[PDB]
Design an enzyme around this catalytic site. Structure first.
Site, PDB file in Angstrom:
ATOM      1  N   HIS A 147     -15.428 -14.380  43.488  1.00  7.41           N
ATOM      2  CA  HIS A 147     -16.239 -13.380  42.752  1.00  7.41           C
ATOM      3  C   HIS A 147     -17.441 -14.005  42.071  1.00  7.41           C
ATOM      4  O   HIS A 147     -18.416 -13.302  41.728  1.00  7.41           O
ATOM      5  CB  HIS A 147     -15.350 -12.700  41.715  1.00  7.41           C
TER       6      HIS A 147
ATOM      7  N   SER B  75     -19.927  -7.133  39.691  1.00  8.02           N
ATOM      8  CA  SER B  75     -18.621  -6.921  39.089  1.00  8.02           C
ATOM      9  C   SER B  75     -18.589  -5.549  38.390  1.00  8.02           C
ATOM     10  O   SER B  75     -19.092  -4.572  38.947  1.00  8.02           O
ATOM     11  CB  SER B  75     -18.296  -8.051  38.103  1.00  8.02           C
TER      12      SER B  75
ATOM     13  N   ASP C 115     -13.683 -12.483  47.866  1.00 10.12           N
ATOM     14  CA  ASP C 115     -13.729 -11.901  46.500  1.00 10.12           C
ATOM     15  C   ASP C 115     -12.766 -10.750  46.369  1.00 10.12           C
ATOM     16  O   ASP C 115     -12.828  -9.774  47.130  1.00 10.12           O
ATOM     17  CB  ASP C 115     -15.182 -11.474  46.206  1.00 10.12           C
TER      18      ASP C 115
END
Length: 287
Positions: A275, A163, A222
């Site tokens: 994610h 991330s 994602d």
């Protein structure tokens, strides 16, 4: 529900199934294992026992780096950017790991796309937020990587993050390349899971020019690797490894500039939920 940059945060019902992929090569078991192992290291950054607890006893910690020794942990409050340096003598590796905020959905929905100049390379621009966070944490980690590499000069350096942490990873890897002359494509590598776009076209060409291996793993639908938008000037360098379905259907788009053939093929049917898990490893909650 809601969208960012034309992409869903929550997946509809009846999205088109993910389309079959026939350059693009299927990842070997060995490659999957290696991506998995560095995804696991990235996951440990969300464990409070690791940062700021400064212990290496978490579940994914002992699974992926059983002989790990934490050298340093650090936190910048302003953006909740956290990270650590860890050494494995058994794997002869110095790990530099980063996260950003674990508030993923707001972080994506509120994200702003403004560039700042990337000062090492004229014409190159990076997301202003990511770069401010980097400039806070660089003071904490850079001397420590220098120090460990002096003490263990045959070890390789792996920089990893999930991330927004993946954005820090890439910026760290480029800084290490620029300023730590003992590191090169032989002994430095960058691995990420769910990395957003970080800079503009020129930044991406620069990253590719360094020859530092930059691996971008992306989990099914994602959303995060699809923001900020290309239409604003952003572009991924690195080689995309796209998890279509575990355990074996992981596809490598071997080109070093993002293509239409891996995860960009499922846009705009994306999700924030995707994610949160990479190779069965929970990313964001230390589960």
């Amino acid at each position: 529900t809601e969208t960012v940059g034309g992409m869903t945060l929550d997946l509809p019902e009846n999205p088109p199934p993910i389309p079959a992929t026939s350059e693009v090569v299927t990842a070997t078991a060995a490659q999957i294992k290696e991506l998995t192992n560095y995804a696991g290291v990235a996951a440990t950054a969300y464990c409070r026992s690791v940062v700021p607890g400064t212990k290496w006893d978490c579940k994914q910690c002992l699974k992926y780096v059983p002989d790990g020794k934490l050298i340093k942990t650090f936190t910048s409050l302003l953006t909740d950017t956290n990270g650590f340096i860890l050494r494995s003598d058994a794997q002869k590796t110095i790990y530099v790991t980063f996260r950003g905020t674990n508030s993923f959905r707001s972080a994506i929905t509120d994200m702003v796309f403004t560039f700042t100049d990337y000062s090492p390379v004229k014409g190159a621009k990076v997301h202003a937020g990511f770069l401010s966070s980097y400039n806070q944490v660089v003071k904490d980690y850079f001397p420590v990587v220098q120090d460990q590499l002096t003490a263990y000069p045959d070890y390789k350096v792996i920089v990893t993050g999930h991330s927004l942490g993946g954005a820090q990873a890439l910026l760290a890897g480029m800084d290490l390349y620029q300023r730590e002359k003992r590191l090169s494509p032989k002994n430095l590598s960058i691995y990420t899971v769910g990395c957003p776009r970080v800079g503009n076209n020129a930044f991406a060409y620069y990253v590719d020019s360094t020859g530092i291996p930059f691996h971008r793993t992306v989990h099914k639908r994602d959303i995060v690797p699809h923001v900020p938008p290309q239409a604003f000037g952003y572009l991924h360098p690195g080689v995309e490894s796209w998890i279509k379905e575990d355990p074996a259907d992981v596809q490598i788009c071997t080109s070093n500039i993002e293509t239409k053939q891996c995860s960009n093929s499922i846009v705009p049917f994306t999700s924030i939920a995707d994610h949160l898990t990479y190779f069965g490893i929970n990313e964001g909650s230390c589960l």
